[PDB]
């Protein structure tokens, strides 16, 4: 996250770290959202790959022991059937992970709440991105979970010529864009938490930034719009 601040230990308990086996150890690669005790929502490009993954829940500092972590295997990966890795801008950047065991819920680990199908946010809606990714363009990962305030930018403005143009679709959310704060590498897969009717829900899966850099004036961070996928999500959970 560029332009962010450290999150409190307990404020985003559905954030997860998706990790891969890496030489003799494990390395963070993406975020995700815990949505069921044994299901994780992440980006399809995060799983685009023949790696071995684990998920960590109850995580705050990647490199030090908190009191609170649980480490769990991935037993099944379900990418969206229309995902095309040669075309990110087509959409469909979403994936579900079945975990090997169910996690135990607590104040550090809770289910993320999903939006109602079809829900579209107003322009400038209050949202936060969270994650351990880069804190500057070309920089290094955060050791602690960061957050940034990233208000939404509606489809009409985002798909305009000065912003993203036709790269963005109606099946995505844009947020941010001020040149200051951003998602960045290592944050994709993670949530965008938006305040609606007094509760935070997860409206975005972080997907892409500008080829120029993470925090670039009026190229907001782009997210998969979760509310486009609620039937799909429910159908996968119900069939496997």
């Amino acid at each position: 996250v560029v332009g962010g601040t450290e999150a409190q230990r307990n404020s985003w308990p559905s954030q997860i770290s998706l990790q891969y086996r890496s030489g003799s150890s494990w390395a963070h690669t993406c975020g995700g959202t815990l949505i069921r005790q044994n299901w994780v929502m992440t980006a399809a490009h995060c799983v685009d790959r023949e790696l071995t993954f684990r998920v960590v829940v109850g995580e705050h500092n990647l490199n030090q022991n908190n009191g609170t972590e649980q480490y769990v295997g991935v037993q099944k990966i379900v990418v969206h059937p229309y995902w095309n890795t040669d075309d990110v801008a087509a959409g469909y950047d979403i994936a579900l992970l079945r975990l090997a065991q169910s996690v135990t819920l607590n104040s550090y680990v809770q289910l993320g709440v999903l939006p109602r199908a079809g829900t579209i946010l107003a322009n400038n809606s209050p949202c936060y991105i969270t994650g351990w990714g880069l804190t500057r363009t070309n920089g290094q990962l955060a050791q602690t979970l960061q957050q940034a305030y990233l208000p939404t930018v509606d489809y009409a403005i985002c798909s305009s010529s000065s912003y993203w143009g036709s790269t963005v679709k109606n099946s995505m959310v844009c947020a941010g864009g001020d040149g200051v704060r951003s998602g960045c590498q290592g944050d994709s897969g993670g949530p965008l938490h938006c305040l609606v009717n007094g509760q935070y829900a997860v409206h975005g899966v972080t997907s892409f930034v500008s080829r120029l850099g993470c925090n670039v004036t009026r190229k907001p961070t782009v997210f998969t719009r979760v509310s486009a996928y609620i039937s799909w999500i429910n159908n996968v959970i119900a069939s496997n």
Partner: peptide
């Protein structure tokens, strides 16, 4: 676009 991972 550039995807958020390394480097997708």
């Amino acid at each position: 676009x550039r995807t958020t991972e390394f480097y997708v």
